[model samples]
Target: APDENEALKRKIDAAKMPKEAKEKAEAELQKLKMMSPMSAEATVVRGYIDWMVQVPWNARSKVKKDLRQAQEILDTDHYGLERVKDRILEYLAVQSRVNKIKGPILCLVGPPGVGKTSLGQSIAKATGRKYVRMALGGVRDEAEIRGHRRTYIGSMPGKLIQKMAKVGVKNPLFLLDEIDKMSSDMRGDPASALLEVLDPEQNVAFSDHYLEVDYDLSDVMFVATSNSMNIPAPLLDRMEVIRLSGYTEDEKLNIAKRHLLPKQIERNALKKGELTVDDSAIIGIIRYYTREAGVRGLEREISKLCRKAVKQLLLDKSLKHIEINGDNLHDYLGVQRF
Candidate 1:
């Protein structure tokens, strides 16, 4: 195997990776001098060295830090989450002013489907950073967080290391979803491991066991979302908690009309005028069919309704318009749905 020997040499001199990292890689290279070429340990050394070269240590996405632009994107994507948007804009504004503001690791606490995940997406879009998401629910192994040791068979680098290479950016908006849950075992303390990842003061030298060296992550924005505020106290203390409440019946109805209905209409291959849902009928669906914080169930019900409307429209070529009011909702749903 060529083993990236020349490639590694070129990167140390030319690649804009940090000075500390270069020194660290050089130190490791010195240690590798004594290892045999054909041994498993040598393979591990080569893979680790290869990783440092492959990672986009100098690759940073161009950030657009305009406060108004950030807010506009947030408002357009979500419905009536001005409080959340304002918080994010202020965060971005500080970044624009100072060139580098210590990140306020944000923990978005909310009911399911209440735009928590979408909030991270919008931030990544507005700030012009590549988005990377990892769902941390029920993940017990600390290896899952920092990755397994290279000597272990079938060992792989952690998600963070993998994501950096995949995104090809040093600074990416990394969303850690479902952070409320904990591992039931004693071998791993995932909640504690996150402290290093989320803390602005600590993440710069994030050491992955698989990488076997410190990888700076201060430039990355770490966003976490949880359905509840039941996170461990130490881990919770490291973040700025943004409470995202659910949309009310009226708000969800508006969401259904503005966002969900039109989307389903297009997905079912029907025009706006061809299929219509009355106001009371929508309210009835919200009041009865669904029982969640956001419009997940509402969206599903609307899609189901539109799918049925597809049959009606396809069956009757003469019917240019089919209005579904509260009275005839059961006719379409056929499930005795309110």
Candidate 2:
């Protein structure tokens, strides 16, 4: 316990944090040093210290502002979301011109499998920042966001602080997934609890229940995503909404052939040229087997075809290559789901 305490102290000493935070940590350490190691009090203090030390209070990534490179990366990862891609480039452009500004909070609204979530990761890569995601689908408790008070046993900081500590960076592309799914109850209103955290003006001194200190969240680039506009008006007001609609037949076909098919082939342990899916087969699947605005279901059907192809190759030693086309697509994937 003594050695661990000193180790924690060294980390605290080396950590770059706000002055008030450091003082608070040291003060807690002082109290911890006098307490018995076996006491419950020591455990709580130890937990607190561990949490404080893990936070990247001052650490930040050198954000990349190369608009051209960002655009290239975005286009490569995603198919055809020109509006979303353009908006990100504009953000980078503005950031390049203005040295200091609050990170823009964006809300990507779209149907299921429309690539809303994956776009956030692309944004992080384009901007040269770390990526972190928090799924708020079923979060019903206020403490889930702000944290539980110290008076309660097993108290800990909220998901926001925990995620920050995990990413080990002050400025990360934080994606709050499924913002429309949050429901509140008797415990407290989690949706309402998010007001201060999402608000740019108030988040500078973001307060957590357990930490009992204001942690700055102004540096975080928050991107919220939802399937619909079911979010509370107050919370929704904080974000710049960007809608991602479903893909067209041509777009879906292109995505499948370009991205999904090759990826599925590799994933199913099939070597190059061992399995080939014709454009007609993919379009056939898109038309009769799967129907969606996004390529997720299309990708799934492609994976199934790859898996069946692999099995055929395994079963028939004489078979060298297998091809899937509109004519025999039914044999591989069975009747159409559509």
Candidate 3:
């Protein structure tokens, strides 16, 4: 009893938690001390108390107020998605107006590899907040979104609360990837559970079953990505969605040249001059080799070509230089067909 009081007293003083939070911690500590260990509620109260005091209440990251700098960071990290970039800048502008503003939840809808996930990361960088991606794709259980009630064995807080505690901050940017792809399992619909999280007014005092208290997720930026509009239409209205149509062939070619090629080259350990894949070669691959909108498949093709080049060099030690061009694509890869 004394140990519990000692620890909790120190926590309340040093935490500098809000009046409600300190009161909640003090009340829970008493419950924990009075409840017998054999009682079912004992562990649950202890866990709730742990989360109550363990949160980094004072941890806050300051973001840049310069609009120009934020745009530059977005542009430098991603190539296309101008619409997405501009939308985020607008969000940033609003944030600049208020020292403490409720973050607008952003939904990035696209086929694949349109840089939806990466755009969210860029936002975290611009805002100077810790980044954590909660991949909700194929997640079925509602308990994952909201923690299991403490009455059950092995109960824990939801993903969002855990993420905050893990990052040691209350204002980290959370990437809720593939929010639309989840389904209704035996537990319930995760999308329904997420209504409060995406809602502007509702999420400020977001509550979790385990924590049993209001959490200010309003300060945390939430970005969701999906291949299609799988989420309910009514629920979708809650978030501002940015649609990124698949990249044009020209855009894909440019991306390969500027980003993918250099990335794959260094990864494959190819000397700078050892192999050259020019615009014409990339266009040829896009037209004849692959059929897709995003650069994901194109990236794979580049990786394949690099691997082949390495193999060719391994076989023929005398080869001075190899060039991948439109004319000789068939020579490197098998028969090409548009």
Candidate 4:
């Protein structure tokens, strides 16, 4: 038991945790000595220590701020969300000039299936930060964001702390998806909890209830995505809102050709040359099959066509390639909906 305590003390000492957290951890270890290894109290304390020590504390990626590279990365991943790409490029350009500043809190609002979520992914890749996504859909309790108090055996840290530990980086591109969907109940309002997380000033000393100490989040870039501007006014104030409207027919067509079709072809186990969907066919599907602000529906139709093509190609071994044009699109996708 003494040896284990000695080992834990050494670990805490070696850990890059803040002075305040180190003190708290040392105190927790002192309590662990009085209990049996298999006791409930000891297990809980051990789990707490595990989280405290494993947290990135001081570890962070050297963020890449090359504006040119970021632009290229964003453009390659997305087809024509030009305005969204521009704002991201500007953000990087600003960060490049300013030596140190709080992470920019950006809220991207768009209809479902639009590129809001994927834009966060692209930004993360561009900036060279490890991507971490936490969906805020229907998350009602305050503890969901700030974490449950360690007063009970079932207590644990919030998603922010948990994700930070998993990423093993102090500064990461954290995407809080579907912020509009979070609701409130008797427990607490999660939106208010997010207020603390998203607020550039307050988040510097983000005090998770479980961690019971301030964890600096100023360096962690927080991006929130929503289907609409339904976020509360106070919360909205903390974010720089960017509206991503539905793509035009031209934009969607280019997206399908450049990104979606090729993606689904491989996903459906078809080689590149095995399936060729004409521009007219994709346009037809976009118009007649589905209509949405985002290209998700278009993608599904393309996936369906790929599935049918796979089947037909198998059934007729002599057919080297399967092409779906505008006229024969119905055969693969069934009768058009529109």
TM-score of candidate 3 on Cα atoms, chains taken together: 0.80
Models sorted by lDDT, best on top? 4, 2, 1, 3
Which of the two, 1 or 3, has more lDDT?
Answer: 1
Tens-place lDDT per residue, model 2, 123-155, is 889889899999987798797998887653588
Relative to the unseen true structure, what is the C-alpha lDDT of residue 195 in candidate 1, on a scale of 0 to 100? 77
* lDDT against true structure, model 2: 0.82
Candidate 1 structure quality by residue, lDDT tens digits, 219-249: 8877888888777788777578788785778
Q: Which parts of model 2 are misplaced by more than 4 Å?
A: 97-104, 151-153, 315-320
59: Cα error in model 3, Å: 1.5
Residue 71, model 3: Cα distance from true site in angstroms: 1.7
* Candidate 2 TM-score, true structure as reference: 0.91
lDDT of 3 by residue, 1-338 (tens): 55663565676667657666667766766666664554566766656667776676666787667887888888777653646677888988888766445554668888886777777888888878789989887778788888877665578888887888778777788888887767777686777778777676777667788877777666677787787888876567757778887688878877788778888888988888888887888988888877777777778788888878878888898986678988887777678766
The alpha-carbon deviation from the true structure for residue 277 of candidate 4, after best TM-score superposition, in angstroms, is: 1.1
Deviating ranges (above 4 Å) for candidate 3? 1-16, 31-54, 80-84, 99-104, 266-275, 307-323, 327-338
True-vs-predicted CA distance for residue 243, candidate 2, Å: 1.9
Clashing pairs in 2: none
Q: Give the RMSD in angstroms, all C-alphas superposed, for model 3.
A: 3.9
